[PDB]
Design an enzyme around this catalytic site. Structure first.
Site, PDB file in Angstrom:
ATOM      1  N   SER A   1      -2.415   5.163  20.319  1.00  0.00           N
ATOM      2  CA  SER A   1      -1.768   6.405  19.917  1.00  0.00           C
ATOM      3  C   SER A   1      -2.297   6.924  18.584  1.00  0.00           C
ATOM      4  O   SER A   1      -2.424   6.179  17.621  1.00  0.00           O
ATOM      5  CB  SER A   1      -0.245   6.276  19.884  1.00  0.00           C
ATOM      6  OG  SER A   1       0.294   7.574  19.702  1.00  0.00           O
ATOM      7  N   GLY A   2      -2.625   8.213  18.555  1.00  0.00           N
ATOM      8  CA  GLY A   2      -3.130   8.875  17.366  1.00  0.00           C
ATOM      9  C   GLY A   2      -4.600   8.625  17.044  1.00  0.00           C
ATOM     10  O   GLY A   2      -5.067   9.008  15.970  1.00  0.00           O
TER      11      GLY A   2
ATOM     12  N   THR B   1      -6.984  13.530  22.132  1.00  0.00           N
ATOM     13  CA  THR B   1      -6.737  14.940  22.349  1.00  0.00           C
ATOM     14  C   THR B   1      -7.712  15.818  21.569  1.00  0.00           C
ATOM     15  O   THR B   1      -8.214  16.814  22.094  1.00  0.00           O
ATOM     16  CB  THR B   1      -5.285  15.251  21.987  1.00  0.00           C
ATOM     17  OG1 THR B   1      -4.451  14.690  22.990  1.00  0.00           O
ATOM     18  CG2 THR B   1      -4.994  16.725  22.088  1.00  0.00           C
TER      19      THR B   1
ATOM     20  N   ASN C   1       1.817   9.581  15.486  1.00  0.00           N
ATOM     21  CA  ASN C   1       1.007  10.770  15.594  1.00  0.00           C
ATOM     22  C   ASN C   1       1.878  12.000  15.454  1.00  0.00           C
ATOM     23  O   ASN C   1       2.758  12.239  16.289  1.00  0.00           O
ATOM     24  CB  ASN C   1       0.288  10.766  16.944  1.00  0.00           C
ATOM     25  CG  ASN C   1      -0.665  11.917  17.106  1.00  0.00           C
ATOM     26  OD1 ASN C   1      -0.793  12.778  16.220  1.00  0.00           O
ATOM     27  ND2 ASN C   1      -1.368  11.944  18.251  1.00  0.00           N
TER      28      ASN C   1
ATOM     29  N   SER D   1       1.586  13.943  18.771  1.00  0.00           N
ATOM     30  CA  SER D   1       1.482  13.077  19.945  1.00  0.00           C
ATOM     31  C   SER D   1       1.658  13.827  21.259  1.00  0.00           C
ATOM     32  O   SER D   1       2.616  14.592  21.452  1.00  0.00           O
ATOM     33  CB  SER D   1       2.470  11.925  19.873  1.00  0.00           C
ATOM     34  OG  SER D   1       2.248  10.993  20.916  1.00  0.00           O
ATOM     35  N   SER D   2       0.690  13.626  22.142  1.00  0.00           N
ATOM     36  CA  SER D   2       0.809  14.016  23.528  1.00  0.00           C
ATOM     37  C   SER D   2       1.858  13.163  24.186  1.00  0.00           C
ATOM     38  O   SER D   2       1.778  11.947  24.130  1.00  0.00           O
ATOM     39  CB  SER D   2      -0.516  13.810  24.273  1.00  0.00           C
ATOM     40  OG  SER D   2      -1.576  14.424  23.593  1.00  0.00           O
TER      41      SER D   2
ATOM     42  N   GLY E   1      -1.843   7.575  24.500  1.00  0.00           N
ATOM     43  CA  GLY E   1      -2.429   6.402  23.936  1.00  0.00           C
ATOM     44  C   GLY E   1      -1.440   5.276  23.846  1.00  0.00           C
ATOM     45  O   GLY E   1      -0.223   5.465  23.683  1.00  0.00           O
TER      46      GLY E   1
ATOM     47  N   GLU F   1       0.990   2.642  22.868  1.00  0.00           N
ATOM     48  CA  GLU F   1       1.951   2.691  21.780  1.00  0.00           C
ATOM     49  C   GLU F   1       2.968   1.559  21.767  1.00  0.00           C
ATOM     50  O   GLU F   1       3.434   1.083  22.799  1.00  0.00           O
ATOM     51  CB  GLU F   1       2.662   4.053  21.712  1.00  0.00           C
ATOM     52  CG  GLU F   1       3.456   4.437  22.934  1.00  0.00           C
ATOM     53  CD  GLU F   1       4.128   5.825  22.822  1.00  0.00           C
ATOM     54  OE1 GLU F   1       3.559   6.740  22.184  1.00  0.00           O
ATOM     55  OE2 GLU F   1       5.223   6.022  23.424  1.00  0.00           O
TER      56      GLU F   1
HETATM   57  N1  ADP Z   1     -12.285  14.406  14.987  1.00  0.00           N
HETATM   58  C1  ADP Z   1     -11.149  14.772  14.263  1.00  0.00           C
HETATM   59  N2  ADP Z   1     -11.200  15.656  13.264  1.00  0.00           N
HETATM   60  C2  ADP Z   1     -10.111  16.012  12.553  1.00  0.00           C
HETATM   61  N3  ADP Z   1      -8.898  15.504  12.830  1.00  0.00           N
HETATM   62  C3  ADP Z   1      -8.817  14.623  13.839  1.00  0.00           C
HETATM   63  C4  ADP Z   1      -9.912  14.266  14.565  1.00  0.00           C
HETATM   64  N4  ADP Z   1      -9.590  13.347  15.540  1.00  0.00           N
HETATM   65  C5  ADP Z   1      -8.198  13.015  15.344  1.00  0.00           C
HETATM   66  N5  ADP Z   1      -7.692  14.014  14.370  1.00  0.00           N
HETATM   67  C6  ADP Z   1      -6.513  13.770  13.519  1.00  0.00           C
HETATM   68  O1  ADP Z   1      -5.677  12.750  14.052  1.00  0.00           O
HETATM   69  C7  ADP Z   1      -4.524  13.327  14.707  1.00  0.00           C
HETATM   70  C8  ADP Z   1      -4.171  12.626  16.007  1.00  0.00           C
HETATM   71  O2  ADP Z   1      -5.212  12.813  16.983  1.00  0.00           O
HETATM   72  P1  ADP Z   1      -4.877  13.033  18.531  1.00  0.00           P
HETATM   73  O3  ADP Z   1      -6.275  13.397  19.219  1.00  0.00           O
HETATM   74  O4  ADP Z   1      -3.662  14.052  18.584  1.00  0.00           O
HETATM   75  O5  ADP Z   1      -4.358  11.595  19.042  1.00  0.00           O
HETATM   76  P2  ADP Z   1      -4.249  11.052  20.560  1.00  0.00           P
HETATM   77  O6  ADP Z   1      -5.384   9.953  20.575  1.00  0.00           O
HETATM   78  O7  ADP Z   1      -2.836  10.366  20.509  1.00  0.00           O
HETATM   79  O8  ADP Z   1      -4.405  12.349  21.415  1.00  0.00           O
HETATM   80  C9  ADP Z   1      -4.884  14.786  14.907  1.00  0.00           C
HETATM   81  O9  ADP Z   1      -3.742  15.612  15.082  1.00  0.00           O
HETATM   82  C10 ADP Z   1      -5.667  15.038  13.629  1.00  0.00           C
HETATM   83  O10 ADP Z   1      -4.772  15.149  12.539  1.00  0.00           O
HETATM   84  F1  ALF Z   2      -0.347  10.493  20.389  1.00  0.00           F
HETATM   85 AL1  ALF Z   2      -1.513  10.242  21.747  1.00  0.00          AL
HETATM   86  F2  ALF Z   2      -2.714   9.988  23.042  1.00  0.00           F
HETATM   87  F3  ALF Z   2      -1.402   8.502  21.633  1.00  0.00           F
HETATM   88  F4  ALF Z   2      -1.564  11.974  22.003  1.00  0.00           F
HETATM   89 MG    MG Z   3      -3.024  13.233  22.521  1.00  0.00          MG
END
Ligand code: ADP
Ligand code: ALF
Ligand code: MG
Length: 726
Positions: A181-182, A186, A226, A229-230, A450, A452
Site C-alpha cells: 500500500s502506497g 496508481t 496512503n 489509497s485506492s 496494495g 496492507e
Molecule cells: N512517481 C511518483 N512521483 C510523485 N509522487 C508519487 C510517485 N509515485 C507515488 N507517489 C506518491 O506516493 C503516493 C501514493 O502512491 P499511490 O500510487 O497512490 O499508491 P498505491 O501503490 O497504493 O496506488 C502518491 O499519492 C504520491 O504522493
Molecule cells: F493505497 Al494503494 F494500491 F495500496 F492505492
Molecule cells: Mg492506488
C-alpha cells in the site's frame, strides 16, 4: 541537439546519473575491495561498508567503521560492487548480486531522484514521495519508439516496449504494477496510460485520462498508509486498432471497500468525494442538499481527520466535475450523483433509539427527511423499511421490529449498497463512453489495492492481500516456473534452480476447494442458519490450526487468525465476517428506492447489472465466491497476454521523501523476488525462436544448420525446436 546526448537537457538532468568528479574517479580506480556487513548481527538489514584487508582460501578479513577487524566466510560474504556500478541502470549488470548491493544501487539512484531502475526484465520504481519533472510531453516524446537499452529507466520505456511488442508480435500485453500500500501503483498506472494515449493517440484519449479523477474521487480515501489509497482494484484495457492507434478503453473495477462509507479508523478519511462535495459546492447547492461541514456528519466526524496535507478538497471537486463534463455525464446526472452523496451523509445522521419495547424508534426525523428529500423517496416508507422490514417466515409475511443496533446496521447496509452501486454505475457510464470500437489488441494495466496491514484487519484486508499474493504468484510463475519448464522441455542442458518463491500454499489456504480453504469455510458458514462469527473462527481453527503451515491460531485472542503471506504474517479479526460475506440488504429497502423519483437512483435499483445479485442454488452468491471468480477471470485474461512487471517499492512507512529505510526496502526486495528475478535473467536464456521461423527472418530442411551458420557460442544454446539467446 538530441536530448539523450545533450548533458544540458532535462533528460540528462533528471533521468541520468550525475557526472562524478575527479575525487570520485580516484576512488573509482582504487585497487581496494569492500564488503557490506552488519555492525549489529541482530539488525541484518543495517549495513556498513568495510574494507577487505586480507583473505584466506575460504574467508575475508575486513575493517569495520569503528576500526576493529572481522572475519567472514567467503560464501557468506556480501561483497560490495566496484563503485563504477553505483547508479547502474540495469542491476543485472552488477558483478555481485546480494541484498545490500542491490539496495545500495537503488539508494545511490534514489539519492539523486532516479526512482526507476531495471532489475533484469522488469522495472523497479521507488516512491519518491515528491514531484520529479520526468513526466512532461517532452519526456514522453524522448521515449517514443526507443528501445529499452537506448534510454534511461522509466515507466514510459516499459510502456513503449509493451506497445512495440503488441505491434511486432500481434499479441495482447499487460503491465502488472505490484507493490504494498502506497508504493506508487496508481501513480505509475496513470503514467502508463498518459504515455500510451500520447504515442498512440490521434477527445477519446482525453476521456481515457479524465476517467481517473472521477474514479479516484469516489474510489480513493486517506488510509494510514496512503493519503490517496485506492479502495478498489482496477484493470484498465487500453484498446488499439490493427494499425496501433488507440480505439478505446475499458475499466474493470474490483470490489470497492463499501465499509469505509460508514466507518473509518482514527486519522483515516472516508472517500474523497464526500469532502470534495462539502468543501467545493456552491452555497446554493449546499442549501438544496441540506449540507453543512464534515464535522456535522457521523460518517465524516469519527476519525478526527477531515483534511489531507497539501490537498484542497474544493479544488479537487472542481477537477472531478470537469472530468465528469469531459467524459459526458449530463448536468442532470451530476446533480443526481451529488444528491446520492448528500443522501448518504444524511442517512448516516439518523439516530435510532430504544422504544417502549426492544424495537427501535426514530424520535427525530430531520436526517431521515433530508435523505428522503434528496433521494426522491417516501420517508414513511423508508422509516418502516429500516426499522420494520418485512421478511418471509416460511411463506408467511412478518414485519420485523429491529432493535437499535440492527436498525443502524440496516441503515448502513442501505448506505453501502447506494455507494457501491453508484460506483459501479459510474464505471459503466465511463466504459460506454470509451467503448467506440471493437479492439484489435489491448494493453491491460493492472493496479490492484496494495498489500496492507493495520491494527485491525478484516475481510476487506484478506481480499486485498489474497489478490496481492495471487499477483506475486503470477510473477513467480512467469519469471521462474514457466521459464524453467521451457528450458527443460527444450533440453538446452538446464539445471533446475529452486528460487524459493512460492505463494501457492498461502493461496490454497485462502481459496482452496478440496480440501476447503478459508473462503470455502466462510461460504459454508454463511449459509448455515445457526452460524456465528464464533462458530466460524472455531471452524477455521479446526481445519487449519497446527495443520496448515501458513495458518496460526493465536494464543492471545479467540477471534483472530493469522495468515502468513509473502509480504508477512497478517492477523485477521473475524468480527462481522458472516455478514460481510452475505452482504445483506432488506428487500423493503430496495422496494422503497425502486420508487425513487430520481433517474440515477432508479437505475441503481432497477438495472439488473447493478441491482441484481447472482444466485448459487437457494442462496445468493457470496462476496467471497464472487471475488474469487472475478480474480480467477482476471488471471485467465492475464495468461493470454505478454506481461511486463513494474515493482513499486515504498521507501518508508511515513510517506516522506529523501528517507530510504533499509529494513522497509529490503523486506520488499526480498518478498518481491527481485534478486531472484535478476538471477534468472542473468543465468537463463530470455529469447527463443523456432529454428524454421529464425531462418526465414535471418527455407531449409536442416533448419538448425542454417541457424548455426548465421551465428560467441556462450550467448546461445540449441534446443530441440528452438534456438535460445541471452
Ligand atoms: N512517481 C511518483 N512521483 C510523485 N509522487 C508519487 C510517485 N509515485 C507515488 N507517489 C506518491 O506516493 C503516493 C501514493 O502512491 P499511490 O500510487 O497512490 O499508491 P498505491 O501503490 O497504493 O496506488 C502518491 O499519492 C504520491 O504522493
Ligand atoms: F493505497 Al494503494 F494500491 F495500496 F492505492
Ligand atoms: Mg492506488
Amino acid at each position: 541537439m538530441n536530448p539523450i546526448h545533450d548533458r544540458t537537457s532535462d533528460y540528462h538532468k533528471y533521468l541520468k546519473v550525475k557526472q562524478g568528479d575527479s575525487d570520485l574517479f580516484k576512488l573509482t580506480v582504487s585497487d581496494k575491495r569492500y564488503i557490506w556487513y552488519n555492525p549489529d548481527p541482530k539488525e541484518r538489514d543495517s549495513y556498513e561498508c568495510g574494507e577487505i584487508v586480507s583473505e584466506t582460501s575460504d574467508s575475508f578479513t575486513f575493517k569495520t567503521v569503528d576500526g576493529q577487524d572481522r572475519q567472514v566466510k567467503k560464501d557468506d560474504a556480501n561483497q560490495r560492487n566496484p563503485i563504477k556500478f553505483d547508479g547502474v541502470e540495469d542491476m543485472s549488470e552488477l558483478s555481485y548480486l546480494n541484498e545490500p548491493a542491490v539496495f545500495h544501487n537503488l539508494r545511490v539512484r534514489y539519492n539523486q531522484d532516479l526512482i526507476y531502475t531495471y532489475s533484469g526484465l522488469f522495472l523497479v520504481a521507488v516512491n519518491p514521495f515528491k514531484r520529479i519533472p520526468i513526466y512532461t510531453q517532452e519526456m514522453v516524446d524522448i521515449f517514443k519508439g526507443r528501445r529499452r537499452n537506448e534510454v534511461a529507466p522509466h515507466i514510459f520505456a516499459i510502456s513503449d516496449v509493451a506497445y512495440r511488442s503488441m505491434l511486432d508480435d500481434r499479441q495482447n500485453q499487460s503491465l502488472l504494477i505490484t507493490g504494498e500500500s502506497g508504493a506508487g501503483k496508481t501513480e505509475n498506472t496513470k503514467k502508463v496510460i498518459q504515455y500510451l494515449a500520447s504515442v498512440a493517440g490521434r477527445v477519446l484519449e482525453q476521456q481515457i485520462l479524465q476517467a481517473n479523477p472521477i474514479l479516484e474521487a469516489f474510489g480513493n480515501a486517506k488510509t494510514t498508509r496512503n493519503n490517496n489509497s485506492s479502495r478498489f482494484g482496477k484493470f484498465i484495457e487500453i484498446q488499439f486498432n490493427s494499425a496501433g492507434f488507440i480505439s478505446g478503453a475499458s475499466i474493470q473495477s474490483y470490489l470497492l471497500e463499501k465499509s469505509r462509507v460508514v466507518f473509518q479508523s482514527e486519522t483515516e478519511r472516508n472517500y474523497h468525494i464526500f469532502y470534495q462535495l462539502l468543501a467545493g459546492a456552491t452555497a446554493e447547492e449546499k442549501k438544496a442538499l441540506h449540507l453543512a461541514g464534515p464535522e456535522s456528519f457521523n460518517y465524516l466526524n469519527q476519525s478526527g481527520c477531515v483534511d489531507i496535507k497539501g490537498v484542497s478538497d474544493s479544488e479537487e471537486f472542481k477537477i472531478t466535475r470537469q472530468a465528469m463534463d469531459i467524459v459526458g455525464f449530463s448536468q442532470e446526472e451530476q446533480m443526481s450523483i451529488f444528491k446520492i452523496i448528500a443522501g448518504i451523509l444524511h442517512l448516516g445522521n439518523i439516530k435510532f433509539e430504544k422504544g417502549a419495547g426492544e424495537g427501535a424508534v426514530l424520535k427525530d426525523k430531520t436526517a431521515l427527511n433530508a435523505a428522503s428529500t434528496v433521494f426522491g423517496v417516501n420517508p414513511s416508507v423508508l422509516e418502516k423499511a429500516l426499522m420494520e422490514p418485512r421478511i418471509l417466515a416460511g411463506r408467511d409475511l412478518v414485519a420485523q421490529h429491529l432493535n437499535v443496533e440492527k436498525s443502524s446496521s440496516s441503515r448502513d447496509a442501505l448506505v453501502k449498497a447506494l455507494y457501491g452501486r453508484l460506483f459501479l454505475w459510474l464505471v459503466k457510464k465511463i466504459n460506454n463512453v470509451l467503448c467506440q470500437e471493437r479492439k484489435a489488441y489491448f494493453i491491460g494495466v493492472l493496479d490492484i489495492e496494495g498489500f496492507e496491514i493495520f491494527k485491525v484487519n478484516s475481510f476487506e484486508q484478506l481480499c486485498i492481500n489474497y489478490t496481492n499474493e495471487k499477483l506475486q504468484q503470477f510473477f513467480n510463475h512467469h519469471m521462474f516456473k514457466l521459464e524453467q519448464e521451457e528450458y527443460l522441455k527444450e533440453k538446452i542442458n538446464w539445471t533446475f534452480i529452486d528460487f524459493g518463491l512460492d505463494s501457492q500454499a498461502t493461496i490454497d489456504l485462502i481459496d482452496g476447494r478440496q480440501p476447503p480453504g478459508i473462503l470455502a469455510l466462510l461460504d459454508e458458514q454463511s449459509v448455515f442458519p445457526n452460524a456465528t462469527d464464533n462458530t466460524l473462527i472455531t471452524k477455521l481453527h479446526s481445519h487449519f490450526s497446527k495443520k496448515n503451515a501458513k495458518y496460526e491460531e493465536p494464543r492471545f485472542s479467540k477471534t483472530e487468525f493469522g495468515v502468513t503471506h509473502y509480504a508477512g504474517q497478517v492477523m485477521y479479526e473475524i468480527q462481522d465476517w458472516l455478514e460481510k460475506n452475505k452482504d445483506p440488504l432488506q428487500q423493503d429497502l430496495e422496494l422503497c428506492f425502486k420508487d425513487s423519483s430520481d433517474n440515477v437512483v432508479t437505475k441503481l435499483f432497477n438495472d439488473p447489472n447493478i441491482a441484481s445479485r447472482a444466485k448459487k442454488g437457494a442462496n445468493f452468491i457470496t462476496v467471497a465466491a464472487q471475488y474469487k471468480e472475478q480474480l480467477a477471470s482476471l488471471m485467465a485474461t492475464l495468461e493470454t497476454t505478454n506481461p511486463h512487471f513494474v515493482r513499486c517499492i515504498i521507501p518508508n512507512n511515513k510517506q516522506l521523501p529523501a528517507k530510504l529505510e533499509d529494513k522497509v526496502v529490503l523486506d520488499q526486495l526480498r518478498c518481491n523476488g527481485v534478486l531472484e528475478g535478476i538471477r534468472i535473467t542473468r543465468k537463463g536464456f530470455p529469447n527463443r525462436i523456432i529454428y524454421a521461423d529464425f531462418v526465414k527472418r535471418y527455407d531449409a530442411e536442416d533448419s538448425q544448420k542454417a541457424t548455426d551458420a548465421v551465428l560467441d557460442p556462450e550467448q546461445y544454446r540449441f534446443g530441440i525446436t528452438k534456438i535460445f539467446f541471452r
